[PDB]
Design a protein around this ligand. Sequence first.
Ligand SMILES: Nc1ncnc2c1ncn2[C@@H]1O[C@H](COP(=O)(O)OP(=O)(O)OP(O)(O)=S)[C@@H](O)[C@H]1O
Ligand SMILES: [Mg+2]
Lengths: 404, 48
Amino acid sequence: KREQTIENLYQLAQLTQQVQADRIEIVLEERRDEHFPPMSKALMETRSGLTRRKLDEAIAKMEEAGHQFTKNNANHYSISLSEAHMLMDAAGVPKFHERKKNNENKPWIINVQNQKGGTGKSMTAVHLAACLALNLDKRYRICLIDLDPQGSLRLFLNPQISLAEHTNIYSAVDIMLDNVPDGVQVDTEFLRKNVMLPTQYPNLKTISAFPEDAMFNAEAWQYLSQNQSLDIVRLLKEKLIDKIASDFDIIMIDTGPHVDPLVWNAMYASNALLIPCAAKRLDWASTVNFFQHLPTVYEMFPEDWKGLEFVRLMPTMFEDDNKKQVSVLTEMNYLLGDQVMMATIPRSRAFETCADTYSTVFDLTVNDFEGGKKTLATAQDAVQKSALELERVLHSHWSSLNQG
Amino acid sequence: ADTYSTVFDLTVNDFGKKTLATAQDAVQKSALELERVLHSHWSSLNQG
DNA sequence: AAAAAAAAAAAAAAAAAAAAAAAAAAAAAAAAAAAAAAAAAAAAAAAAA
DNA sequence: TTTTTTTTTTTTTTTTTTTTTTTTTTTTTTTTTTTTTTTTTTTTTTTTT
Ligand SMILES: Nc1ncnc2c1ncn2[C@@H]1O[C@H](COP(=O)(O)OP(=O)(O)OP(O)(O)=S)[C@@H](O)[C@H]1O
Ligand SMILES: [Mg+2]
């Protein structure tokens, strides 16, 4: 009988070996051939905030040192992002993990979870993270997590850079099981070695994910077969959170459009709550279902966790000029005001261009594209004022949630 | 054409209306004019 | 050590194209009227109760 | 003096041709929004006093 459907299943194969090809050419085509945006003595002022006098003093102190400054084709000064973070390293400006006021802090775990497909969590959240990383005055050690097995956050120009030299790896899955060589114990040095990777920024870091992570849900069903205390919830907490809380301060986490055991652990173990969403009716209805589903499930999780300290909703794909969606936003501000961000993330062709070349808004400048300037200008400025207002929620709660 | 028919073998009742009515009106004026040409050169035919 | 001159830059102004809206025209009907065609009710004629 | 049949009046019904009106689709049409080239403004270095 299933002669032609041996043909047909091994022709889903004889097409996904051609898609194995296709990914080979995708890798060959994405390859970097780019330079990071320069600060032009005014963009430097706007972004870093260093005064011209102190900047001159520091760049001279470094100029007499080993490193040499560089200039554009014109004698006008131009300093690269690498040179930027180097001058920050040598600025002596301490971070939240070096400030005498507060240096022994735990991670500020920030998450982006929506149960609605394709509406913006990936792109908006990676944009938000790369913008928060623009806080060069403070050198945040940031961990981007692409917990969505299909996110491009390991590939999208803030990526998990798995060069050819990269030998082997053990994803969050294998941290949920300790499937590394049984002889070696998973210590934080191992975590730097094969879990924490750079993102072409000397400050921003990441974790990668893989479609094999979907097998985690099957293994969790198997564990429910072998367990009944729902103890897999704490598997994340001890394996990952206790091992990472010692030596980082922020962890960007994308989770995916889905609500699943993996995403249940992401929800629970995390000590902060953010809720991405759009202004559409059905989306907010799904959020209603979400607000019914949670409380009982949190009751299911161990009583040791005293609930998440703050809850806020997000906009996205917000055209800002459609009557229905602004009415929805008004209703949200009417119901959970002070627990929803005011900031708006608009949609424009500039984001499309950014995505198609994979390059985040910061990676490209006006010369790269057309005059979708002010659109990108107000996009990055809303994302940065939104980053400081979410981090100001976190500031006012650096009394509460750090002591629980 | 498609129905393998001719212009005349279907009548107005066959169904258009004014459309086909003017259709055969024009076709039948063209036939008058044509067959008049037919005399005009047919008198030449009888004599060759 | 400072001034002036020279060179690589953003902001404003001008022109054209694609979105949309209203009106008009070709058409394409379902309904009615007029004319035409196919049968019918009082009167008339001849041979005969 | 009566009866029968046929040729004229008129009456009834139907089809075809030709009457009007409405809706749908197609064509010409400026306002608003979007795109590209640009003249003015800002920054740095070298040379001279
Ligand atoms: N500003 C934007 N401009 C253009 N496309 C956008 C924008 N924001 C979101 N998108 C759409 O989002 C797609 C990829 O981004 P995401 O929406 O994050 O996908 P995602 O990971 O499923 O997140 P969700 O489920 O939509 S919230 C793009 O291919 C677009 O279709
Ligand atoms: Mg997604």
